Amino acid sequence: MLTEGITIQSYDGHTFGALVGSPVKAPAPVIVIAHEILGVNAFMRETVSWLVDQGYAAVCPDLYARQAPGTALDPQDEAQREQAYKLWQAFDMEAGVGDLEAAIRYARHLPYSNGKVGLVGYSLGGALAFLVAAKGYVDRAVGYCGVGLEKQLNKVPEVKHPALFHMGGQDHFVPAPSRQLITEGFGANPLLQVHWYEGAGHSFARTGSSGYVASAAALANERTLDFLAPLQS
């Protein structure tokens, strides 16, 4: 689901929609949410609503618009999971970073903006969040469950704004040697944080998922809110 009439235009003229939640009170910092491999779906709607309740505005851009506009897949359904995997496989990461850059500029100039922008990414979006942190487009970035971080380590010293990552300790995408590489590499830059959630796998924070772990999701989300709080007026 997207907000009717909202259009954001990127570096190369491509345009894309977004789900937008205005803040309870103006002004407010704006959080750009980078979605999972499933597009702008029920969990994005819930995440928008949560951040608004917590004193933010939120913008969740349609990052699959270069492949199939309006993707919104329900992970309960096998056919929709399959569609999600196929879209992810073909996803252009560099274009996603450019699209996020455009969504960030858009967020910055919203009328109720207090001038500060954060980004929160999940799954596909958690990997995008690290790339955005390396580019330095936002004041603070958060990624949950990012895949392939261990292949992006040479970007660690490029990070010049705080970024926080939450990773399941049992995430099959991140086996022991990858966990050790990420732990050692990110630890060299004190602007980065990476927290591991023992006994939690991938999607440990996605309500409704068979991988959801309420205690781990609780701790991660609390740390997220405390990390974003300094953006507030």
What is the residue extent of each domain of the chain? 1-233
Question: Residue 161 and residue 158: Cα distance in Å, rounded?
Answer: 9
Distance of alpha carbon 1 from its chain centroid, rounded? 17
- The CATH superfamily of 1-233 is Alpha/Beta hydrolase fold, catalytic domain (3.40.50.1820)
Q: 3-state DSSP call for residue 23?
A: coil
Residue 98 — φ and ψ, nearest 5°?
A: -65, -40
Rg (C-alpha) for the chain, rounded Å, is: 16
Resolution in A for the shown PDB structure? 2.0
Strand partners, 58: 21, 31
Distance of alpha carbon 37 from its chain centroid, rounded? 11
Residue 157 DSSP class = G
Cis peptide before 177 (omega within 30 of 0): no
Q: Which residues contact 121 (CB under 8 A, 6 or more apart)?
A: 33, 34, 35, 127, 128, 129, 132, 141, 142, 143, 144, 146
Interhelix angle 124-135/93-108, rounded to 10 degrees, is: 70
CB 141 within 8 A of CB 118: yes
Give the method used. X-ray
CB 103 within 8 A of CB 183: no
Q: Where are the alpha helices (DSSP H) in the chain?
A: 42-53, 78-89, 93-108, 124-135, 176-187, 214-228
Question: Residue 47 and residue 228: Cα distance in Å, rounded?
Answer: 14
Question: Residue 201 and residue 203: Cα distance in Å, rounded?
Answer: 7
Residue 155 DSSP class = G
